[PDB]
């Protein structure tokens, strides 16, 4: 109802509550229907023309008084004073106050209404990405911080399923839209029914601009742009800046806390033998730095924690001995073994050739 009063005051939380269930009125459909793409057909006085048709039509009850048409100037300062007042936090408290006529009001960093947890630099990252994900511009993120996992668990905080297309430099427009001879399409399916793309940095750019410019696509064969009227936030990932999304998408930017994290994750790995294996990963990095065709990561240390967890039902020198098996010189395998036995106890070379 009248909470569209504060319609564009806060972000589209109120527009989402409308998308649950809402109808028009005179000044209501005057107000909220001005979005970036529709077809009006209820009051097309607003878009019919700007001559004395639109320059002289009417407007019903603008401050509950009936001016004519240009009460936009009555309103495009009245809403701007509210947009100034909302620079003064408890803004979401005001939005929840404003919802006073009990839906799935999600909190978060600020608010919403739609595994991978942390209370760390990841909390500041979720702080840095609550804003634009509320504002629904296309976002990005710019190795090994779990940024794909960050977006994945962010979508898990939502009610959204991140179809994660790893677009590549050989991609056709198929999983974009599909080829017919009627094409089902994949990106068109997610536009139809949260989306994520990766390897965007290395045609496809034009398709991104069509999705990016406005929530609609160039379906060339079927001939219909798609009103993407849900939560179609087409988040991406690459660590560079060279694309049109550098103009188009609102770009956005502590590993040793992983020590606590697996301590959080694996309960019976509460020993810092875990952190000793993190130091073993550091020593593996120092041995790499015959040719380092691999990079020890927090994903890699998490997988080492996984194989150690598989062990710990039952020592584990063989475990990290597997964790450097990608080493094309057996001398280098022996050096990894020496580094490990330095991190471990005394020399079991018996295990080294079992």
């Amino acid at each position: 109802d009248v909470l569209i009063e504060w319609v564009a005051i806060y972000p589209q939380i109120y527009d989402i509550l409308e998308h649950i269930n809402y109808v028009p009125s005179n000044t209501l459909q005057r107000l909220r229907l001005h979005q970036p793409w529709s077809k009006i057909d209820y009051d097309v006085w607003f878009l019919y023309a700007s001559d004395e048709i639109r320059e002289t039509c009417k407007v019903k009850y603008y401050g509950e008084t009936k001016t004519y048409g240009e009460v936009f100037v009555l309103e495009n300062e009245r809403i701007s004073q509210l947009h100034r007042l909302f620079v003064s936090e408890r803004a979401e408290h005001l939005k929840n106050l404003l919802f006073d006529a009990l839906p799935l009001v999600e909190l978060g960093g600020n608010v919403f209404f739609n595994s991978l947890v942390l209370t760390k630099s990841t909390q500041e990252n979720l702080n840095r990405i609550t804003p634009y994900l509320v504002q629904k511009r296309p976002i990005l993120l710019a190795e090994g911080i779990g940024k794909k996992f960050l977006i994945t668990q962010i979508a898990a905080k939502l009610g959204q399923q991140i179809i994660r297309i790893h677009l590549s430099d050989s991609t056709d427009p198929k999983m974009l839209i599909g080829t017919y001879t009627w094409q089902p399409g994949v990106l068109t399916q997610a536009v139809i029914t949260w989306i994520l793309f990766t390897n965007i940095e290395h045609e496809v750019l034009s398709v991104l601009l069509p999705l990016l410019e406005k929530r609609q696509l160039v379906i060339p064969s079927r001939g219909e742009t798609i009103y993407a009227k849900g939560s179609f936030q087409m988040f991406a990932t690459s660590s560079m800046k060279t694309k049109i999304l550098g103009q188009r998408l609102w770009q956005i930017l502590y590993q040793p806390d992983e020590c606590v994290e697996v301590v959080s994750t694996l309960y019976p790995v509460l020993s810092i033998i875990c952190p000793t294996l993190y130091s073993v990963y550091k020593d593996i990095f120092d041995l790499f730095s015959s040719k380092i065709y691999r990079r020890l990561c927090l994903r890699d240390f998490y997988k080492f924690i996984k194989r150690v967890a598989f062990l710990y039902h039952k020592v584990f020198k063989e475990a990290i001995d597997m964790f450097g098996a990608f080493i094309p010189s057996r001398d280098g395998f022996d050096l990894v073994v020496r580094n490990v036995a330095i991190e471990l106890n005394i020399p079991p070379e018996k295990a080294l050739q079992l």
Partner: protein, 741 residues
């Protein structure tokens, strides 16, 4: 011409031997030197074979036909852009040059053109040394007095010495720009000279749209210096202004037919872009090739977006940088969806004018915005069930009766939609697509379009170009547009300024107000009137004068309608609608009428600023009206002060009823002379108004400076010593005060 006749004499010498004639000439010309000679050649048809990339040999022998008809009927076959060929079509051309007749595979073995000489556009060099040694090559520069001779076809509405000045200016401009730092190739060709000459015939503008296209501001300063060196003037920039009325939106010696509005946009006026938004609007009116060139993220799509948004010219864009092809510019359900969309468009334009329709016709409209397309047949039922309905069903029932074939056999352009409709096309981001794609575009740049999706032997060029403007964005990040399309367009850079109200309105999503906050004039009026009547933060004379001098006459009526100093301005509003410009507007109309002038009364101080060369002619027709307004307002102040006159001056004015006054008459008669000078034909015919205002300040300064009566009277006598009645009243009051003195 003369030299053109020498080149044509060379081509005549060339035709005396049976081979292909190649034009081995320096660039810039084009094949006009053979496009024209055919008219002076024995009825020889001009087969302008624009040989390009997407051009198969099957597009040159067919039969499984322009080159085929030229092999059949004898003609001049102008083969454009041989260097851009696919090297089996090149082989086919070599075979055609050979004496042996074509030995087709595809229908028959070979064809038996008594004298079909084929001329060859040896383009900017590539060609194979066998194709370029079986032909015959003909050599091809213009001259300055010869350029005046070519200008003589344009010197009807041209000051002829100013024509020689424009020609010498372009020549020495290129000759001086090709010797220093200023970056681009900087073409500056004779097509631009003829463009400026034919721009002159539709009355500063020449300098504006021939040196807005120097991007580095230092080079712009040097170009203005060269303009002073040649044209002998000072290139002070004529300030433009956004007059945005209903039937026309206009900026600075450029209007626009702002007629039916499609876009319904969401970007604002961007007032700092007003210095270049005009320079394309003129380019939108002269039907020149719009090139919103320049640099990235500065705002270029918003310029053309706002321009054809206010104009309503149905912007539609194609991002030609995807290595797109010439065929990309020029299956049941696709036609069904296009039918639904066009049905919606025609129903929209229907409900625009005769707003009476509803009935499942509104359900037909909802269906129109909604293969298994059998429901479209239901649409035709709605097309089944007046004369406006007849005009809609003319397209609709025809396309739907064709759509009855939606159970039949199938057989499954970009710009050719807009070139045949009335939309405005935006080749966006179009720096790096192809040279030849823009070459086939520039074939249509100078209109008739030769397609190949037609049937057999006929070109069928679509001449609907009225409201069809090639607006090409660019950026500097990729490679620049090629020198051909640079040499055949209106280059217009853009930059970044961020002025005060500009940055206030662009980033206004926090603040409360823009300045020009719509694309509808009845809103923009109340917007700017809410701004400048809030931007206001012996005084109020020049204030009230300039304030009631800058606001528009429609805005003057509006300020009266909206009824410290602004409160007293309502008295000035009543007194102005009494006597702001009673016959002063008659001088302005007649004074305004002799010079080229608008159709109505929209701008005043911009009109005062607008004849900026004319009032630099010393006529001062517009300026004297401005001072006359100050005379009237100051006069009203002096007269109300004198009605208040109806401490020593208080004593004299009382002694109308110390004793024996001399000051009161000395004031009251001169103030009567003032109000006489306010309201009368020679009062309109009165720079001397400044001298009268000197006395107006003088009567002010004496009513403040009210012993010294002798000297003050001698001063009033000097401003009289500075027409009969207006000093005659000072003569009476002064001789009376000197009878007292």
């Amino acid at each position: 011409t003369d030299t053109t006749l020498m080149n044509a004499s060379k081509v005549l010498r060339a035709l005396q031997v049976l081979k292909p004639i190649l034009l081995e000439g320096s660039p810039g010309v084009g094949k006009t030197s053979l496009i024209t000679a055919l008219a002076r050649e024995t009825g020889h048809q001009l087969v302008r074979i624009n040989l390009s990339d997407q051009t198969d040999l099957m597009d040159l022998f067919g039969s499984d036909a322009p080159f085929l008809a030229a092999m059949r009927n004898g003609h001049w076959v102008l083969l454009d852009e041989l260097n851009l060929a696919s090297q089996s079509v090149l082989e086919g051309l070599n075979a055609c040059l050979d004496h042996r007749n074509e030995a087709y595979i595809p229908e028959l073995d070979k064809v038996f053109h008594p004298n079909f000489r084929v001329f060859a556009a040896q383009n900017p060099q590539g060609l194979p040394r066998s194709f370029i040694n079986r032909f015959s090559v003909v050599y091809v520069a213009l001259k300055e007095k010869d350029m005046i001779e070519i200008a003589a076809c344009n010197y009807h509405q041209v000051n002829e010495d100013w024509r020689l000045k424009i020609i010498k200016f372009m020549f020495r401009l290129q000759d001086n720009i090709e010797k220093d730092i200023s970056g681009s190739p900087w073409e500056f060709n004779l097509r631009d000279t003829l463009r400026w000459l034919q721009l002159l015939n539709d009355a500063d503008y020449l300098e504006v749209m021939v040196l807005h296209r120097m991007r580095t501001v230092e080079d712009r300063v040097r170009t203005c210096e060269l303009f002073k060196e040649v044209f002998d003037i000072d290139y002070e920039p004529r300030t433009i202004g956004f007059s945005l009325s209903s039937q026309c939106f206009k900026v600075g010696h450029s209007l626009l037919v702002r007629d039916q509005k499609t876009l319904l946009d969401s970007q604002n006026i961007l007032q700092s872009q007003l210095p270049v938004l005009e320079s394309v609007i003129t380019c939108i009116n002269k039907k020149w090739p719009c090139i919103l060139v320049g640099d990235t993220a500065t705002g270029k799509t918003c310029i053309l977006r706002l321009l054809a948004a206010i104009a309503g010219a149905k912007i539609k864009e194609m991002a030609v940088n995807s290595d797109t092809d010439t065929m990309d510019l020029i299956d049941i359900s696709r036609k069904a969806s296009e039918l639904f969309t066009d049905l919606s468009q025609q129903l929209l334009n229907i409900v625009i004018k005769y707003r009476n329709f509803d009935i499942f016709r509104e359900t037909s409209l909802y269906t129109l915005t909604t293969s298994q397309a059998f429901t479209l047949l239901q649409k035709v039922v709605d097309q089944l069930d007046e004369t406006l309905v007849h005009s809609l069903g003319d397209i609709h029932e025809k396309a739907r009766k064709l759509l009855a074939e939606f159970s039949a056999s199938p057989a499954g352009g970009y710009l050719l939609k807009a070139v045949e409709e009335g939309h405005w096309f935006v080749l966006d981001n179009a720096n790096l697509c192809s040279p030849a794609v823009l070459d086939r575009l520039n074939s249509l740049l100078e209109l008739i379009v030769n397609e190949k999706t037609t049937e057999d032997g006929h070109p069928k060029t679509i001449k609907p170009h009225p409201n069809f403007r090639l607006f090409l964005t660019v950026n500097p990040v990729y490679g620049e547009l090629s020198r051909a399309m640079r040499n055949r367009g209106v280059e217009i850079f853009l930059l970044k300024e961020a002025l005060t109200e500009i940055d206030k309105k662009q980033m206004s999503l926090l603040e409360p107000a823009p300045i020009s906050s719509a694309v509808d004039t009845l809103a923009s009026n109340i917007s700017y009137i809410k701004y400048v009547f809030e931007t206001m933060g012996n005084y109020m004379y020049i204030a009230h004068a300039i304030i009631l001098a800058l606001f528009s006459p429609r805005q003057l009526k509006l300020l009266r309608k909206v009824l410290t100093l602004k409160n007293l301005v309502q008295k000035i509003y009543c007194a102005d609608y009494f006597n702001h410009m009673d016959l002063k507007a008659s001088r302005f109309m007649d004074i305004y009428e002799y010079p080229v002038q608008l159709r109505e009364v929209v701008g005043l101080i911009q009109t005062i600023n607008d004849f900026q060369s004319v009032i630099l002619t010393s006529h001062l027709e517009l300026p004297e009206t401005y001072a006359s307004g100050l005379l009237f307002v100051s006069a009203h102040e002096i007269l109300d002060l004198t009605e208040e006159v109806n401490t020593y001056l208080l004593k004299s004015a009382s002694a109308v009823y110390g004793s024996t006054p001399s000051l009161w008459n000395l004031l009251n008669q001169f103030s009567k002379f003032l109000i006489e000078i306010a309201s009368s034909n020679i009062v309109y015919k009165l720079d001397v108004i400044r001298h009268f205002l000197k006395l107006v300040v003088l009567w002010k300064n004496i009513y403040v400076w009210t012993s010294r009566f002798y000297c003050y009277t001698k001063m009033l006598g000097e401003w009289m010593f500075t027409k009969l009645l207006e000093s005659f009243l000072p003569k009476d009051s002064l001789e009376k005060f000197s009878e007292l003195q």
